[PDB]
Amino acid sequence: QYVRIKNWGSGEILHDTLHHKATSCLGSIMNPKSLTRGPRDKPTPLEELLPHAIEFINQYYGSFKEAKIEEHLARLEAVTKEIETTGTYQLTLDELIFATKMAWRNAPRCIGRIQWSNLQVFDARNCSTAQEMFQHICRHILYATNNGNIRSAITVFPQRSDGKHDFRLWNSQLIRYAGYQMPDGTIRGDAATLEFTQLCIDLGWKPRYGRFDVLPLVLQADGQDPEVFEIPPDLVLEVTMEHPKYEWFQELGLKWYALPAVANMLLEVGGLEFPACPFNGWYMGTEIGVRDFCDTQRYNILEEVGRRMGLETHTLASLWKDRAVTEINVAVLHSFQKQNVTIMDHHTASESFMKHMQNEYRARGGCPADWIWLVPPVSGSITPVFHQEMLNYVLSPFYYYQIEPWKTHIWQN
Amino acid sequence: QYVRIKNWGSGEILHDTLHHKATSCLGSIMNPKSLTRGPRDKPTPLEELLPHAIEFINQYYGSFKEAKIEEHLARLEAVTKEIETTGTYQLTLDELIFATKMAWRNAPRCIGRIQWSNLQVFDARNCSTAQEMFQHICRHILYATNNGNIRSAITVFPQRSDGKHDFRLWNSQLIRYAGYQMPDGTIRGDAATLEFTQLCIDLGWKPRYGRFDVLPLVLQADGQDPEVFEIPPDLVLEVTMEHPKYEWFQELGLKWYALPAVANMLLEVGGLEFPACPFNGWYMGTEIGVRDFCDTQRYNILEEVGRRMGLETHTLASLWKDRAVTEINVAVLHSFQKQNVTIMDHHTASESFMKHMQNEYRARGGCPADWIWLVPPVSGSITPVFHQEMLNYVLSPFYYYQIEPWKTHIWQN
Numbered sequence: 057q058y059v060r061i062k063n064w065g066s067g068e069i070l071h072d073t074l075h076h077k078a079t080s081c082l083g084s085i086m087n088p089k090s091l092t093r094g095p096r097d098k099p100t101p102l103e104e105l106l107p108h109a110i111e112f113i114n115q116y117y118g119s120f121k122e123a124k125i126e127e128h129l130a131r132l133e134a135v136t137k138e139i140e141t142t143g144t145y146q147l148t149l150d151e152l153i154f155a156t157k158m159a160w161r162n163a164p165r166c167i168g169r170i171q172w173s174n175l176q177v178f179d180a181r182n183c184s185t186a187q188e189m190f191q192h193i194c195r196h197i198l199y200a201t202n203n204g205n206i207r208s209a210i211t212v213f214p215q216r217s218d219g220k221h222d223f224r225l226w227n228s229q230l231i232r233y234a235g236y237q238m239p240d241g242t243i244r245g246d247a248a249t250l251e252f253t254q255l256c257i258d259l260g261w262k263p264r265y266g267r268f269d270v271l272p273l274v275l276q277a278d279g280q281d282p283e284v285f286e287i288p289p290d291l292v293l294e295v296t297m298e299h300p301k302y303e304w305f306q307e308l309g310l311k312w313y314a315l316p317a318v319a320n321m322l323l324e325v326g327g328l329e330f331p332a333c334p335f336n337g338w339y340m341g342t343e344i345g346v347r348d349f350c351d352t353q354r355y356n357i358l359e360e361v362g363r364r365m366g367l368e369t370h371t372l373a374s375l376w377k378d379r380a381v382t383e384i385n386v387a388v389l390h391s392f393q394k395q396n397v398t399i400m401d402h403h404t405a406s407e408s409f410m411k412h413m414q415n416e417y418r419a420r421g422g423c424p425a426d427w428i429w430l431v432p433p434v435s436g437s438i439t440p441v442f443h444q445e446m447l448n449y450v451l452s453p454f455y456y457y458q459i460e461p462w463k464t465h466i467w468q469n
Numbered sequence: 470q471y472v473r474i475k476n477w478g479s480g481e482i483l484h485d486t487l488h489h490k491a492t493s494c495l496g497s498i499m500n501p502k503s504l505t506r507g508p509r510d511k512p513t514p515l516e517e518l519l520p521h522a523i524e525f526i527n528q529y530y531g532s533f534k535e536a537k538i539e540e541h542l543a544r545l546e547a548v549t550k551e552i553e554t555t556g557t558y559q560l561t562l563d564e565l566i567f568a569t570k571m572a573w574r575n576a577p578r579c580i581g582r583i584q585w586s587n588l589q590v591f592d593a594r595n596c597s598t599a600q601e602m603f604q605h606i607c608r609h610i611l612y613a614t615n616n617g618n619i620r621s622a623i624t625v626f627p628q629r630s631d632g633k634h635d636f637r638l639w640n641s642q643l644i645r646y647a648g649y650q651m652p653d654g655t656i657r658g659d660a661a662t663l664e665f666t667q668l669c670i671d672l673g674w675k676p677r678y679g680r681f682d683v684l685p686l687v688l689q690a691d692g693q694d695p696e697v698f699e700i701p702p703d704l705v706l707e708v709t710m711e712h713p714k715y716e717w718f719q720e721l722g723l724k725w726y727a728l729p730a731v732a733n734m735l736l737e738v739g740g741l742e743f744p745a746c747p748f749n750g751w752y753m754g755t756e757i758g759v760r761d762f763c764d765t766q767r768y769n770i771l772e773e774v775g776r777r778m779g780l781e782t783h784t785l786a787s788l789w790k791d792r793a794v795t796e797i798n799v800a801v802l803h804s805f806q807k808q809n810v811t812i813m814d815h816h817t818a819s820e821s822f823m824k825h826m827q828n829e830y831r832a833r834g835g836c837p838a839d840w841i842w843l844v845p846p847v848s849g850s851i852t853p854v855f856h857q858e859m860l861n862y863v864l865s866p867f868y869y870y871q872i873e874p875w876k877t878h879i880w881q882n
């Protein structure tokens with residue numbers, strides 16, 4: 057009938073009934089095929105599209121206090137008719153809005169989901185060129201940033217039609233720092249963007265060889281070739297790292313962008329696929345303080361902050377790492393707060409997520425959750441999420457990963 | 470053919486071929502049925518036992534630089550013969566030793582597995598009464614403790630025969646503190662052992678109503694009723710909590726036992742089942758410092774250590790929790806080191822585990838690993854394990870969970 061879910065912290069039990077609406081032991085795999093919706097060079101077969109489309113129209117019209125049956129039946133008919141005559145179909149703006157929030161709502165890996173209903177939708181389905189994409193993206197960045205008072209938003213570009221005319225942002229995130237393979241063996245900047253940085257150069261981009269060089273938007277429109285565009289510096293808002301007690305922190309010359317905007321995911325809804333639909337929320341402290349600054353495959357500033365703290369950076373047992381990373385986290389939080397830039401610490405985030413789950417189970421009996429992703433990279437068992445058993449499952453609408461565009465792209469020049 | 474496993478930190482790739490030898494989306498479930506080997510009231514059907522038995526005899530004799538074929542064939546024959554005439558079969562001491570290390574080696578949830586080959590085996594298969602079990606357990610505790618220089622060991626009691634004559638320790642761990650439902654609503658001691666503490670009282674145990682009262686061994690022998698036994702205090706070694714800078718720490722009057730000995734798991738090997746086989750290794754700092762002392766469902770001393778540190782325990786964003794728990798961890802490590810009691814910090818543990826995995830893949834191409842359990846309850850991404858993708862799968866031999874004995878036990882009085 058259902059599935060019991062226990063919360064070892066409060067002892068509370070829950071019954072998951074929502075997992076029955078899923079699709080189809082790979083433990084900690086980052087990019088599992090089950091979470092990816094790749095390319096296709098032929099339209100969505102009508103026998104597949106029509107059913108998925110109806111289900112979505114039923115979901116949409118099925119959600120409202122005062123349900124209007126007429127409009128529902130009518131939409132069902134007009135949609136089927138549209139599919140018959142055109143092949144694919146066009147969602148109403150209202151439906152799209154609903155789609156994007158639901159897809160987010162159904163994001164197993166997102167901790168910010170309590171905010172799900174609070175999203176801004178930019179309808180760029182009329183878009184047709186790279187330069188027009190670049191303008192919509194700029195519009196996005198400017199609206200989302202709001203001078204530090206960050207706002208969650210998403211820009212939806214034209215849906216995949218036949219598959220050969222795909223709209224795709226080649227970037228992983230909208231704002232992202234560059235990383236270069238320095239002469240003296242060392243890596244400079246964000247070592248994670250090394251491979252993509254090279255690509256930008258190959259497409260003719262002037263590399264400013266620095267630690268915090270904002271990378272260029274690499275836009276692909278209507279299947280065409282990717283065109284490079286430098287993001288207007290005035291648009292990219294950054295925070296300078298500063299510790300509230302360690303005056304030597306600023307001397308580290310650190311900073312990070314305030315806009316966490318996922319750029320390369322595909323939105324699937326009612327059988328339709330939107331290969332380009334960048335979105336953003338606001339940062340959660342640990343993202344910058346722990347992953348960005350502390351991963352060895354990133355800025356790796358941990359040993360650096362260690363010695364300047366006086367810690368025994370040569371004795372693991374001294375727990376100097378637990379000491380440094382915490383102070384780094386404090387810097388991030390302090391710096392965003394001082395410069396009036398939205399941000400939420402992980403504890404607070406975890407609590408709101410728990411409240412979210414409770415709301416989700418009451419409202420629909422379930423909440424697709426990925427424990428491996430929801431538990432913060434620090435203070436694991438200190439956050440309530442660690443103690444909550446949770447079910448992971450792909451629903452619909454949903455945000456899928458895509459095959460890195462530079463692999464499956466037939467060049468023209 | 471195989472399965473690619475990537476380590477996002479070093480970028481290294483690995484090929485898992487060992488997962489093919491497994492048995493048979495439930496994400497973060499603590500006690501999944503797949504990890505439990507419950508009761509049975511009939512012997513292991515010969516058609517099932519014979520094949521499993523052979524596989525094990527092939528595994529055993531298949532592991533050695535200089536393989537002796539004769540002994541192998543002979544053992545195969547004698548084993549089958551024994552199964553024909555008696556039903557079940559008896560493992561040689563050498564085989565049992567090999568079984569216990571392999572079962573440990575195959576423990577997805579254990580981080581200490583680099584130590585796998587370094588285990589002491591106490592053969593108590595001749596045991597027949599509760600009082601004899603109690604003596605073997607005492608012998609175990611005394612050998613494992615070694616006056617602080619902890620030694621990994623396991624005591625194997627008689628295998629399950631028909632299922633109605635099960636040897637079972639009713640305790641979760643050998644040494645474990647009691648927890649009572651105090652008059653004034655509050656809970657005293659280890660809130661996790663509340664239900665079991667009540668049981669001990671019901672079986673006639675004198676409750677000393679304290680924060681650190683070592684619970685009694687509740688032993689069940691040859692299917693008989695569970696008899697209670699108080700662990701000789703001289704045997705139970707404890708460490709007094711003491712911070713190296715905060716002289717007010719000792720004032721908290723904290724302490725914890727030095728012996729982490731899992732008592733209620735079942736050992737499965739070559740079709741045979743050993744329902745009682747307590748084992749132990751040595752503590753990993755975070756276990757006591759984070760889970761035992763900091764979980765809200767345990768001693769919950771976090772807010773307590775917070776205020777005495779001066780921290781803003783009323784503002785989550787101040788990261789006071791990240792500050793306290795770290796100092797608590799420091800206390801634990803410092804206290805065990807000072808009192809000459811073995812212990813390993815989590816960073817060091819993680820590193821050794823990584824070395825283990827590398828050894829496992831080279832030696833047998835795989836290492837069953839549970840990421841959710843291997844990643845420390847603090848400093849997640851700071852440890853290398855967080856970045857390692859890993860496959861979870863039940864092999865054989867293996868240590869299974871059992872249904873809590875007090876549920877499926879037909880009382881006699």
Ligand code: HEM
Pocket residue numbers: 156160163165166167168169171175208209210318321335336337338339340343400405455
């Ligand atoms: C308003 C604040 C929000 C917060 C605090 C939040 C936080 C997070 C965090 C911390 C992660 C993990 C990121 C990583 O480790 O790479 C994440 C992932 C994700 N979030 Fe949210 N989020 C927010 C808004 C949004 C919105 C508006 C959407 C979509 C419309 C969304 C969709 C997702 C998706 C799909 C992922 C997965 C990305 C991946 O798998 O790499 N988030 N979020």
Ligand code: HEM
Pocket residue numbers: 569573576578579580581582584588621622623731734748749750751752753756813818868
């Ligand atoms: C020598 C030092 C050892 C260390 C540092 C170590 C550490 C750990 C840790 C930290 C856990 C997680 C405990 C929890 O959160 O409940 C664990 C679990 C486990 N360990 Fe080890 N271990 C050691 C030796 C052993 C030995 C000797 C065996 C078996 C012969 C073993 C078998 C297991 C099993 C089966 C579990 C799972 C228990 C459960 O699922 O609740 N460990 N170990």
Ligand SMILES: C[C@H](O)[C@H](O)C1CNc2nc(N)[nH]c(=O)c2N1
Pocket residue numbers: 064442443444445446497498499841842843
């Ligand atoms: C709900 C969640 O699975 C549970 O609280 C966990 C997770 N990981 C764990 N990790 C370890 N080592 N030990 C545990 O008790 C748990 N419990």
Ligand SMILES: C[C@H](O)[C@H](O)C1CNc2nc(N)[nH]c(=O)c2N1
Pocket residue numbers: 084085086428429430477855856857858859
């Ligand atoms: C190997 C492991 O799955 C990987 O490093 C993880 C795990 N959990 C994560 N959690 C979040 N939120 N983000 C991540 O990048 C990862 N990566």
Ligand SMILES: O=[N+]([O-])c1ccc2[nH]ncc2c1
Pocket residue numbers: 168316317318335336337338339340343
């Ligand atoms: O996906 N997102 O928009 C998103 C939102 C908030 C975030 N904090 N840290 C990473 C991150 C990503």
Ligand SMILES: O=[N+]([O-])c1ccc2[nH]ncc2c1
Pocket residue numbers: 581729730731748749750751752753756
């Ligand atoms: O299972 N064990 O023997 C075992 C060994 C070491 C440990 N550290 N923390 C818990 C724990 C359990």
